[PDB]
Structure formats: C-alpha cells, structure tokens
Design a protein around this ligand. Structure first.
Ligand SMILES: Nc1ncnc2c1ncn2[C@@H]1O[C@H](COP(=O)(O)OP(=O)(O)NP(=O)(O)O)[C@@H](O)[C@H]1O
Ligand SMILES: Nc1ncnc2c1ncn2[C@@H]1O[C@H](COP(=O)(O)OP(=O)(O)NP(=O)(O)O)[C@@H](O)[C@H]1O
Ligand SMILES: [Mg+2]
Ligand SMILES: [Mg+2]
Ligand SMILES: [Mg+2]
Ligand SMILES: [Mg+2]
Lengths: 303, 6, 303, 6
C-alpha cells in the first residue's frame, strides 16, 4: 500500500487556516494563514501559503515544482523556509514561513514619505541598509555554497520578516550548478532584463557572478526606495545599453558606502566581481549583535 | 513588465 | 497531476544494482549494492539496501515505516544515513549508507581468536574499545538531542564501517519524546529484555536513561566479544533478576576504565545514570584526531 | 531469542 511510503513534507489540510491575501503571483495566490502543530514545540505557527491557479500552464506548474523542490533542501536564517506541502487533494498548498512585511520592493515603496500606506516610520537609515545588504548577501552566499544560482535576485524576490530581517525568496528560476559552476539557458523564456549581467544578456550564461550583478541592482532599489531601474528605457534598450557596458547611476543622495558596493557588482568582467561571502565580510563589523548567531557566514557550515 | 521573453 | 508533488527521497530503481546478501532481518533482506548518481559529486556510491518481505505483516510494515521516517530526519556521522527510497514499484527498497563490516555483534564474534571467519587481526584493544564507546555515545547523544529514545540499543543494532567507525542503526523501536521526555509502552510487544533497564521492565517507561542502561550492556558485549548477556537464565528469569536489582558481572579481564562506565550505566535510579554527552566528555581526551571534526559533541549544533 | 513478547 501507498501508505507505507509517505512524503515527509506532507501536511494535513485540516491544520491550515487561511486569513487573508498577502499577494498575487503570476500563476497563483499567496495567503497569510495559521497552521496547527506543524513545528515541534509550537502549538500554532503563522505561515504564508502559496497556491497554484487551476488555470496554471504546464510551464508554470513545472516552475513551481522546481521552486518547492529547491526550497526543501535549504536551511538558512536568511532564506525563506518551506514548512510543508498539502497535496492530499486540491488545490495543492505550499506552506512557508510568514514574512509579515511582504516583499522588499513593496516594503521600500511604503517607506516613501508620501506613501498612502506609510507605516509611520522613516525610510531605511544607512545602518538599516547595510544590515539588509548583509542579510541578502549571507542568504545568497548560502545558496552559492549549496551550488545553486538564483537567476532572479531582485527586491520583489527578497522578503521582510516581522522583525525586519530580509531573506531570499522566489526560487522559480534557480538552477543547480554543482558540476560546472554555471548554467547556460537553452530555449526562450521570460528573463528579468533590468537585473541581468551583460554576459547573461549576451550568452545566456548565469553564474554566482551574474547573481552579484543582480545584488548590485537590489542595492540600487534599496537606495532609491524601489524606483524602476532604467526608467525611460524599454527592455530592448536596456539589453543593448548594458551589453554595451552601461549601468545605472547612483540614486540621489546614495550613501558612499553603498555606492562603492554597486561599483564592485557592476564590473563588466564577471571574474572581477566580488563573492557574496566577501560582501558579508566587508560589512560584518557593523551589524546587529545577533548576526553571528544566525548567519551562514559565521556558521561551522561555511567551510 | 519585469521580464522580457527572449 | 501527481507528478507536481514528488517525494524528495525517491530514487529511481534503475540506479540500484544488488551484489550480495549482507544479512537477513526479521521481515526483510539487507543487500550490499551500488547506486549510480544518488549523491552529488559521486558518480557511484556503495550502499546497503533493505527490502520488506512480501509476507511481512501489518505490524512489521508499520515498524519499517517509522524506521525509515525517523532516519530521514537524522544527520550525524555516528548514525547510519538513509540515502533514498525506491517506491516506484515493488518491492520497496530503502537505500542506506553501506557499513561494510556489518553489525557490531557479528563483527565482535569474528574477532574471537578461534573464529572461522576471523579477519586476521587481534580483538579490540583498550583504545579501540574506548573509540567505539565514544562513537556510539555521540550518535546516541545526537538522537537524544533530537528528542528521540532508541529503545533497542544493542551490539546487533550498531553497525561498523569500512574504516571501523561504529554508528547507531535500527530505529524500528525509536520513539519521539519531545513533549514529555519519556515514552510509556501501550500494549504488548517484543522487547529486548536482556538490554532493558529495571524501570522499563517494570513500568514500560523508556527514557534516555533507559538507553544509557542499554549502552552499558553494549560495553559488556564489546568486552566479552559478544557473548549472550545472562547466559543460563531465560528471559523471564532475567526480567525478575534485573527488576530485583541485579546486573551483569564484568567480563573476564575487562579493562577497569570500561568497568567504571558500566557501573555508571547500571545504577538502579535512572536519574543517577550519566547522559550520553557526559560519556563522550569522559572519553574525549583519548580519541582519534578526526573525532572533533565529525562528532555531534564538538559540533555547533550541540547547544 | 533477543526479544520477549510482554
Ligand atoms: N513567505 C512569504 N511571506 C509573506 N508574503 C509572501 C511570501 N512569499 C510571497 N509573499 C508575497 O506574495 C507576493 C507574490 O509572491 P509570488 O507568488 O512568489 O510572486 P511571483 O509570481 O514570483 N511575482 P513577482 O515576484 O511579482 O514577479 C510577493 O510579492 C509577496 O508580497
Ligand atoms: N547499513 C548497513 N550496512 C551493512 N549491513 C547492514 C546495514 N544495515 C543492516 N545490515 C546488516 O543486515 C542485518 C539485518 O539488519 P535488519 O534488517 O535491520 O535486522 P533486524 O530485523 O533488526 N534483526 P536483529 O537486528 O538481528 O534483531 C544486520 O545485522 C547487519 O548485519
Ligand atoms: Mg517573484
Ligand atoms: Mg516566481
Ligand atoms: Mg536490528
Ligand atoms: Mg529491527
């Protein structure tokens, strides 16, 4: 009987309760919910639950499959945690840790002084921006260490927790690079042009170096409160611009320290760009006391 | 959008 | 479609090749085999594959289910690693790391000078016995830390690797004790009387302390080259003997250091027995240089 | 055997 070979990630639908919509993805919905007894020691746990639209295409379902699969293998404080999967029936539910403040792009925009949904606090201080950068870089370092390339690092894909900790999310485009250290894209597909390195736009080659290029754009989004990169240029113009050696300007009043990081990330030669561990190292002396207690960088696993 | 089919 | 919700532990039957019988369990067979591409970086991996007899009873299948399930959650150098499960068809195959020298009981008996299957080496030296004790205690410490009680620790259930490293195996009787720190047996069932603590024989209560009692018996098996505990007494006589406060004698020419450990393990009051971490600590200064590099005891996880 | 039904 099938019962004798279960899936350890399987969660009973009975334990999940949906409260409200957190956001809408391209082929599904993300809901805030509460789950009963899904974590030892926790009677109830706040969660985010993603569903797949009944109308989702095969390509979209294949993507979600990879996404959930890669998440299962990750254990990092700075990477969004998968908690379980409800597959006993329809619709399939992917249960993840709740990131109360949603995606970084939305969060940043809400911090604009004139924002209708301003939470009543100032935009990110220099200290807060460095902390965000270090958390994103640590999560990315872990991913790189596990031999995966994200390919879609952007503020929209970083999530913010109740305590404002930023973590890497959206592993839909993530690829295994264990054997060769790179991924060469096959056919045609939807690519985040404004976040891509020149060599990826040119040859379709993705490496941890191209993820570093994207990290630089994320710093640009943080320092501009999520404005649109290359506003005024179409995707086709951006592709040509970047391949020709172009890059973004420093946002108005961008802290010199962050500007320096962006300069490192936007070098044309991927081999001259820094690594995620090197970014965390540059920032390690001015972070929250708890960082060494939870980071991949300070962990025994970073060997 | 944020993506381009290419 | 079912395809969109896979089991990460699933392994393709095509990748497994069976070579020979390693041993026969109560309701299945264990075979030595080779597996192709089941571990990243390893083209082929030597494995042990357990099957369940077509004639296995429901009780036996339920037991194997728990066994495979608990193994999935463990990651310790001193605990036998589960590598995958072939459930796409019959028979179900549970793929584990190969412990080339089989179970400790068999191994010890083969080291008796007059053994027909003597491997051509002396019986365990004092140093080798301490190393074995520390490895078993470290694996048990990890299990205890994960809030599980083994309930069936015995030489037959410890396995020996190609490099002679001993690891904890057979999690058939293992129980979760997260909430209460103990497991009270319900109905009737097969219990390893000769390895059981007096309070377990009396009230059916299993704790990490009762596992320590069993650890003492394992030390007795190591120092006697796996003779039968309480040889000459029936299971019923042993039950009565131990509950009355009895215990085993020290095997002939047992090293004083090991005798001292057994004395600690056989205290009548479970609360006065040492913990597995305390056992490793007592032995830590005279172990192989690699121990701190692989042990749970020296790991960051031991917090 | 090593076990007793009890
Ligand atoms: N773990 C989470 N906790 C809280 N909110 C989340 C979580 N994951 C996703 N969200 C929210 O749900 C939205 C949709 O997520 P998702 O379905 O991954 O979007 P997507 O299809 O990748 N689209 P986009 O990221 O906008 O290109 C995100 O922008 C977040 O606001
Ligand atoms: N990972 C492994 N590598 C090598 N040999 C193994 C492994 N696991 C088990 N064995 C061998 O297979 C035999 C049977 O194992 P198993 O099926 O677990 O026995 P069991 O039913 O628990 N019986 P017993 O342990 O004798 O009470 C063991 O005694 C070992 O000799
Ligand atoms: Mg996204
Ligand atoms: Mg996505
Ligand atoms: Mg056994
Ligand atoms: Mg067994």
């Amino acid at each position: 009987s099938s019962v004798f070979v279960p899936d350890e990630w399987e969660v009973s639908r009975e334990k999940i309760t949906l409260l409200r919509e957190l956001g809408q993805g391209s082929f599904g919905m993300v809901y805030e919910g509460n789950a009963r007894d899904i974590i030892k020691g926790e009677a109830e746990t706040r969660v985010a639950v993603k569903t797949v639209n009944e109308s989702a295409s095969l390509r979209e379902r294949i993507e979600f499959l990879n996404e959930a699969s890669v998440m299962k293998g990750f254990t990092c404080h700075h990477v969004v945690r998968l908690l379980g999967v409800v597959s006993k029936g329809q619709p399939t539910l992917v249960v993840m840790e709740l990131m109360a403040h949603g995606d970084l792009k939305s969060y940043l925009r809400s911090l604009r002084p004139e924002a209708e949904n301003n939470p009543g606090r100032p935009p990110p201080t220099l200290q807060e921006m460095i902390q965000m950068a270090a958390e994103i870089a640590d999560g990315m370092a872990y991913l790189n260490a596990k031999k995966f390339v994200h390919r879609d690092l952007a503020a929209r894909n970083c999530m913010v927790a109740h305590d404002f900790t930023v973590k890497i999310g959206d592993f839909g485009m993530t690829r295994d690079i264990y054997e060769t250290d790179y991924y060469r894209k096959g056919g045609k597909g939807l690519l985040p042009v404004r976040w891509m390195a020149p060599e990826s736009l040119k040859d379709g080659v993705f490496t941890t170096s191209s993820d570093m290029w994207s990290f630089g754009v994320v710093l640009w989004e943080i320092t501009s409160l999520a404005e649109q990169p290359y506003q005024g240029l179409s995707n086709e113009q951006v592709l040509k611009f970047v391949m020709d050696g172009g890059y973004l300007d420093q946002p108005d009043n961008c802290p010199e320290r962050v500007t320096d990081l962006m300069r490192m990330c936007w070098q044309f030669n991927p081999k001259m760009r820094p690594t995620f561990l090197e970014i965390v190292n540059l920032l390690k002396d001015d972070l929250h006391p708890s960082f060494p207690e939870v980071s991949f960088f300070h962990s025994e696993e970073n060997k | 959008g944020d993506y381009m089919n290419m």
